[PDB]
Amino acid sequence: MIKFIGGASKVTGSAFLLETGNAKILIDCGIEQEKDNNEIIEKKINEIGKADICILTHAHLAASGLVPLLVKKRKVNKIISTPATKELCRLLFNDFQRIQEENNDIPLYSYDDIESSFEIWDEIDDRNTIELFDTKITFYNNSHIIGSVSVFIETHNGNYLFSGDIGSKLQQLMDYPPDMPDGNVDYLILESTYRDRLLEIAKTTCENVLIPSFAIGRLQEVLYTFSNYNFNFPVYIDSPMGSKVTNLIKEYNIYLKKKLRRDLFNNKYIAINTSNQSKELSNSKEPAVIISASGMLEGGRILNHLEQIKNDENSTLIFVGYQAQNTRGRKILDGERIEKLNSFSAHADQDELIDYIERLKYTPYKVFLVHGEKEQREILAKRIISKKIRVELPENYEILIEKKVVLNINTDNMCNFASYRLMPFSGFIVEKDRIEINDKNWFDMIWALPDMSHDKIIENIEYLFNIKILSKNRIKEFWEEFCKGQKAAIKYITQVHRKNPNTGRRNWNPPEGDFTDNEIEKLYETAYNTLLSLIKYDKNKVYNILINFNPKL
């Protein structure tokens, strides 16, 4: 029941359409660039048809590049990802559209299209199951980039795990072990494969660099690698969108590795903001390390420093990312100092994918290898077959898995009231991996956040509502961020309570009364601790607490 729309090389369009009868759920609607094909992309999106939802795994263009184009032909109803993926998609779509206007290629979608994609853009974080058109959808972290998820869709005809891109051990800002469904996985759609050296050549260039990174993941991991090792010389970020992504991962640090959920980059990262500071740092002859994101030396800011760095016989150029075909970066890496680092790789190797399949609870019925290069997909598929699991490659491309519901109780004692065969029963809806109703005799056969009491939460929210610090708008926004999930509400409450060091203002509503600063700050800390203790509670309990003060949501 799943169609791989261009799921071989991901160029000129790629998509995973899981049609389940009542829903045309769509996964990984993105574009890969090779660097006239746009018409074939257009024909493929018109070939997709009406999709009820455009699930998004991660914020790269491979999975998120055709979302406003599906909005343009109006084929998608709802677009859901993580909030980190949503704002990184904002930066991606704006930069991609600016690149389409700069290169004079006919624009695929429009800026208004990007906006109207964000009209219908819902968001949830990990481990938040949503019941959409009898499909239960859950997100899990797969350690690729920030906000990157693997999708777990339970339909009545089976459980599908769209893995997306899987992270490696060398990813420092995230947990290494990718989160998995705790239940049965029937079909697993897996995408195949495709540090001290950097520091020591930074010594042999500085005391005697230029680093081309990628703005999502790669530049922030180079920055964090330089943050852990404090050497002697300084680091500069000469990249606008890389600086915005760095600031957002500082904002979205609750979505990161658990150790890094407590600043993060411990200062000392002078970021160049405008192009005049860029020309200054290009003409600066001081020994310093310049990390910046253009990609493969083809367009961006890097090119302000390239000339200065290129002719310099003391400088070096540190390729921490893959260089694709027909790019200036590839033309300088092959030869037509030069160092290439292979540890800075967001994509997992083959053995990490074997680890990913092996720590499933059950062995999947069929592993659908989709993207990656051909020969690596071939050898990976052979190693899946050596683990006795079925493989369907997209070039080569069937039981039926029905999740039945059984009554398991007596139905003889039934009556009629309104031409209905109704009977009252008290039982237990046990849920195996075959929802089962079972009577009470079966049950007898079987049988970071602070913490506050419920009455203290009630009295503190009532006090701060009378003091006007907590508001109906505040409770409504907190309920929206809490229905998003716990971590999004943690980020919202931390963002409200955080005191701006330049101005001394918190985003809390000011108290109404004759309170002196100290009392105002103690009331703000009371609101912070009270709503974190509310965050620790259950969702229905939070709804029953917040419906007293704000009658709607």
């Binding site: 009406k50 109006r74 109803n77 709802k78 219908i120």
Partner: protein, 199 residues
């Protein structure tokens, strides 16, 4: 007869558009979120009544021209059966030749229907006295219908087109006084044979 007239009518919405929900269960399920729901399908599209708008338009213009056209808008009024609109849309004796469809949209509710907020500004004090949220259909939304005339005459396409220009002038449904429902129409008719499907 041996020929039938098919008028494919395409509507592009130019102003905001509202047509209120008529199903009591769906309206009562929507009053916990919006005070004015849009008349919507169970397949999540938007339908607009279209026969009454065309009949009202044609009756107003033909009464203005001076023709002997009845007013079936008065309370429990009966059509006489001799008017041109009685021949087209219907009478109590015989059914009408024109079979007007609902205006089903080409897009689903999550793509064309938005939830908006209207107020009641007090004349002095300039404050929000009342505030109500209502659903509406955006501008640029495309609706489709097929008007099916069983026994075509020479003046059936012309009167339908004149009624469509009157609906463009005055609005199709809902809050026509506040500026809602100002739309535009494309017409592609074709006289099809009645025995077409037999083959």
């Amino acid at each position: 007869a041996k020929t039938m007239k098919k008028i494919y009518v395409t509507m592009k919405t130019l102003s905001p558009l509202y047509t209120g929900e008529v199903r009591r269960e769906d309206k009562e399920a929507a009053q916990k979120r919006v005070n004015f729901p849009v008349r919507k399908t169970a397949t999540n599209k938007v339908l607009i009544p279209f026969k009454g708008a065309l009949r009202s338009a044609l009756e107003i213009m033909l009464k203005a021209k001076g023709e002997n056209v009845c007013d079936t808008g008065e309370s429990r009024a009966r059509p006489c059966g001799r008017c041109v609109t009685c021949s087209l849309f219907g009478s109590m004796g015989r059914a009408g030749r024109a079979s007007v469809d609902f205006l089903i949209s080409n897009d689903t509710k999550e793509q064309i229907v938005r939830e908006s907020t209207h107020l009641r500004i007090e004349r002095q004090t300039k404050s929000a006295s009342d505030t109500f949220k209502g659903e509406e259909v955006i501008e640029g939304a495309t609706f489709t219908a097929t008007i099916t005339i069983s026994n075509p005459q020479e003046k059936d396409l012309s009167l339908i087109q004149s009624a469509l220009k009157f609906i463009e002038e005055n609005g199709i449904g809902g809050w026509l006084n506040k500026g809602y429902g100002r739309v535009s129409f494309e017409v592609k008719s074709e006289d099809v044979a009645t025995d077409r499907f037999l083959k």
